[PDB]
Design a binder for this molecule. Structure first.
Ligand code: HEC
Length: 121
């Protein structure tokens, strides 16, 4: 039950590493390249952005669950605390992650913002 307008503001915490760019090249949120493009992330297969070098943990999630896509519930959990999410999904206490950034509040709002820019979900 997120507020996409509030999520757009919270996304300032994400944009250091993530852009939101449409397939025609249009920049919705200009941001960094340390993490993958988040345009269309809602409903997207886990760890499937072409050309991005993902960590072993999240690829294992994708490998072990080939039909898994990002749902709003899962995105909320992952953005709250990425590492334990990977541990939960892989069953591997040593799951490797390229990021540990945690968002403690307004997670549903950020996910609402991302859903807004996943129009074909
Ligand atoms: C602000 C709260 C956010 C949000 C909403 C997301 N991130 Fe990141 N991210 C970063 C890196 C290096 C990765 C790859 C992870 C790995 O390979 O282990 C990610 C991954 C994601 C995802 C998954 C994307 C996919 O294609 O499956 C999502 C949904 C996501 N992030 C959202 C890097 C960073 C940061 C650099 C320090 C920061 C800050 C954030 N991310 C913050 C956010």
């Amino acid at each position: 039950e997120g507020d996409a307008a509030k999520g757009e503001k919270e996304f300032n915490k994400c944009k250091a590493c993530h852009m939101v760019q449409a397939p025609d090249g249009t920049d919705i949120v200009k941001g960094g390249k340390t993490g993958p493009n988040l345009y269309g992330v809602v409903g997207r297969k886990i760890a499937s952005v072409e050309g991005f070098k993902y960590g072993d943990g999240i690829l294992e999630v994708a490998e072990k669950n080939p039909d898994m896509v990002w749902s709003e519930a899962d995105l909320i959990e992952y953005v709250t605390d990425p590492k334990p999410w990977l541990v939960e999904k892989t069953g591997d206490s040593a799951a490797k992650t390229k990021k540990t950034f945690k968002l403690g509040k307004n997670q549903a709002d950020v996910v609402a913002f991302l859903a807004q820019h996943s129009p074909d979900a």
